[PDB]
Amino acid sequence: TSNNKVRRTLREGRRTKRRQKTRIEDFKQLWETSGYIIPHKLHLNIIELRNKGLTELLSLDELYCVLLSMLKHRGISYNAYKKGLAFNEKQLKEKMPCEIQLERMKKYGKYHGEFIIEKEYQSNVFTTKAYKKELEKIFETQRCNGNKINTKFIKKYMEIYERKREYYIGPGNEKSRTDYGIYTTRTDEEGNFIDEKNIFGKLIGKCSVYPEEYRASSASYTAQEFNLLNDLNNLKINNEKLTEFQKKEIVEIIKDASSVNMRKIIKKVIDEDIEQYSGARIDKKGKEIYHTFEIYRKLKKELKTINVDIDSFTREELDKTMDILTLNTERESIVKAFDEQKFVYEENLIKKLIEFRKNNQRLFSGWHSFSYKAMLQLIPVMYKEPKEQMQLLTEMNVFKSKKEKYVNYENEVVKENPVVVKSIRTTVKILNALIKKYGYPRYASRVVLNEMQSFFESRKYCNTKVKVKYNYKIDKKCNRGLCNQTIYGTREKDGKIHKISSYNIYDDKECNSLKKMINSGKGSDLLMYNNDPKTYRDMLKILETYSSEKNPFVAYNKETGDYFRKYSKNHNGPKVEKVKYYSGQINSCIDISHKYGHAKNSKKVVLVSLNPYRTDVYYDNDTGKYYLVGVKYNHIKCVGNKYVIDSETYNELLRKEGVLNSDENLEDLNSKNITYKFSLYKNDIIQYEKGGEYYTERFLSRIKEQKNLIETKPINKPNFQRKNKKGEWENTRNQIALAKTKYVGKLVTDVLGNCYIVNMEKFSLVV
RNA sequence: GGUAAUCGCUCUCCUCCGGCGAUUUUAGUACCUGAGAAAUCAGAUCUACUAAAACAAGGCUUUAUGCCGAAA
DNA sequence: CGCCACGTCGCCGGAGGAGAGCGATTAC
DNA sequence: ACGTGGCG
What we know:
Layout: H1 2-33, H2 46-55, H3 60-70, H4 80-92, H5 97-107, H6 128-144, H7 151-161, E1 215-217, H8 221-234, E2 236-237, E3 240-241, H9 244-256, H10 262-270, E4 277-278, E5 281-282, E6 288-289, H11 295-306, H12 315-327, H13 331-340, H14 347-359, E7 367-371, H15 372-384, H16 389-393, H17 404-408, H18 411-414, H19 420-437, H20 443-457, E8 488-493, E9 496-504, H21 508-519, H22 534-545, H23 552-559, E10 578-585, E11 590-591, E12 605-607, E13 612-619, E14 626-632, H24 651-656, E15 675-676, E16 680-681, E17 686-687, E18 697-702, E19 709-714, E20 736-737, E21 745-749, E22 755-757
Antiparallel strand pairs: 1-7, 2-3, 2-4, 5-6, 8-9, 8-12, 9-10, 11-12, 13-14, 13-15, 13-16, 17-21, 18-19, 19-20, 21-22
The structure holds three DNA and RNA strands.
């Protein structure tokens, strides 16, 4: 679902960012080990340094800065994007992208790939060929100008520069075993690591007859033999069926033919006129559907120029080579696969097959359903006995069943969409529960229906009529969405630290937001944009003259044409398109400013909207006080199995909620009779006694700062939180203070519907 | 009805390799305001432009085409 | 202290498997 | 969906 697509985008982005950091670090190491020192003062006018280096000598500092910049924007190697590519192509016939960006700076003062200007589409997404040409020019100029660079440095820098792993290798290396790439963590009997040649190979589907074998590639010898036998076997001519001798002769002729016209060939082999035709699959659109050997004829006409005999090839060698040509698409993988195959190939054949793959890719459309085992079992009996393929399939009746495992006794069905997997898991859980209690009377739909029918027909004396649970559960996992990204920068006003969000003017919704903020007087009181007093009333002047019911700036550039700039006698003011404004205080935050060089917990840069994990109801028998000590996702140091809250970052919430003082700790609880009464997770069940009616409600989380604040959900349905008025469902919250109440209770509820009352739990420092 | 195989045309899922961004902190310049004839200085450090770093909090040993980390 | 309105990340490009659906069919 | 200040 959208969530796994998100997980993927983040994983790929993280891998690319980490590969970029490694690139920069390796460049720094090469700079150190080559006899040069990293400078301390960095230059900002990088592009002008590129222009200088094209012709004139550059210092070590300038060269270091330009190389560091180059390693970050090394371009792409092989709508607005394609049109921008066309413009870079038409401008690259004379010059390199550095000069184009120079001109963009000179006449527009910007570089990035967003240049709506009819409209022109200047951009920054260039091609690696131009960057490499620029690097070659720069390096040659510096070398000819008596620089300190030696050829080893340029060669090694370009080796670092062109770091690009291949899509069929993935992450991990020969010492960093991960199950996401080629170098895996599984160990053999000797303890050595396991190494593959291509990742997609294991993903190939199984055969439809023998479920322990890999399918065949539809471009080989045996595949085309089988398909041409099926096609010519079905045809009926002159109310006579083709005989075995006729089948052999027609196969020999069609293999030996260059262009196929089976009306003519068939009348030649039969030696009899033709009055009627059946089995011919002429398209109503005007195409004569035939299964003649296609890859055969092209391979014959191609390899016969260099005079290489395909008939000299064995069947297994041809099938194997046709499989590798099907899967492996690049030169290196193909060469390694042909090396692994002990058969010896001339380099001419390798190049010949590679160009054949690259020019007629459409032939290798996919994999034939069967495997080579069933195909080799079928073809000889297909040739000897002139019978239809479907009947020959059921002769050995190899499609018996797969009920052996089911009569021996989820994973046997789960293995056969990451959402319906969970759905069917819940279905089978409930079915087992009801079976143990009492009672036994699409692609996914077909699979699940067949599995249920098979399982219920495996039972003895069963007469079940199978004629044709939305992931409620609970949450118990760690390492979920920790925070909501969006790094925030915060400032200070009269001793209070306020988080600052910028407002985009050029968005209609935000244009209306600024409209209602300015008109209500709630903007001028804030000190944002008050640092320029003259630059503020210009907003009002532009606004009230052109208020309307649209974006005032849109009409401003439509009528006047000029944009909005900063007050200046010389009209030198940079354009204003985004205006910051205060948001409010921060109470819940993640202290990050220590990752910017600032002091610990300086709160200069924060991240907001943390997520909850658990809250532990606490009860003392001395007076029955309430301590709904909550826990959030940040306080957990987990990875898969070690859901450890740790000793610290748990007593601090304990103390803030009032359980403990500065001295008392997690061991000073028995003294006041303090221990768990429950352990509530998201989408749990809790009891309440508001006003002495018992309200059984779903616990969600803790919010705000007020002590004993619980958010509740209607037991019945979370999708009906509180419908207050006639026909509106406001998402009203159940912010409630549990400072003065007297009861709380959990009802562990399995799917069958039973309710279990819970008592003093063990502890929560799992692993 | 159901099953297998083919051909052509239209949608979805998983995995991998990259690019352009966006948001922040620090620094420079412009824009503002004082001193100054101006330059330049100090201070504001709001609105942009340019560099570097951060980019789920955090963890590894494999010190590198390094690795994990937002879904059963 | 209790209410209730605000506000939260996008776009491209190359692959390769694996699922379906709709038309023609050949049949069990 | 659901945190998380401000303003009576």
